[PDB]
Amino acid sequence: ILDYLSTERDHVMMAVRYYMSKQRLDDLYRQLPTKTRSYIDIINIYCDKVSNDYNRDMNIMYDMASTKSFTVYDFNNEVNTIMLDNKGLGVRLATISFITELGRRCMNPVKTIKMFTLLSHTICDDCFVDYITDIS
C-alpha cells in the first residue's frame, strides 16, 4: 500500500479515488430499500464471524491465490462446480469471506470490482438466495 503512495501525487490521487468511491457507496445505500439493507446486515453478521473464526485459513488461502497460475476466471468456475453439489450455507458464506479477503489485498480497483461482480453472480445461486430470504 505504501509502495503505491510514493509521491504527493500518489497520495492525493488515492484520496480522490477514495472520496469518489465512498460517496458512491454512501449514496447507493441511501437508495436501497429496507429489504436489501436487511440482507446486507445478515451478510455482515455471518461473514464477519466466518472471516474472524477462519482468519488463519483465509490468509493461507490467499497465499495460494497469489500463485502465478491462479486466475479468477478458473476459480469462479471451480466455485460454481462446488456449489452445484454442496448446497450448505457454509460454503457460500466462506467463499464470500475469501473473495472479500482477496479484495482487501488487491490494489487494482478495476480488477477487484470485476472479481466482486463475477463471483457475486456465482455465489448467489437459488440455494443461497433461499437461505438469506429465510432469515428475517
Binding site: 491465490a65 471451480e78 450455507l89
Partner: peptide
C-alpha cells in the same frame, strides 16, 4: 491447480460452519 484446492478448503470450512451452526 491452486483454484481447485482452494475451493475444496471452502467446502471443508463450509462443513465446519454447517455442523456448528446447527
Amino acid at each position: 491447480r491452486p483454484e481447485i484446492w482452494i475451493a475444496q478448503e471452502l467446502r471443508r470450512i463450509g462443513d465446519e460452519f454447517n455442523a456448528y451452526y446447527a
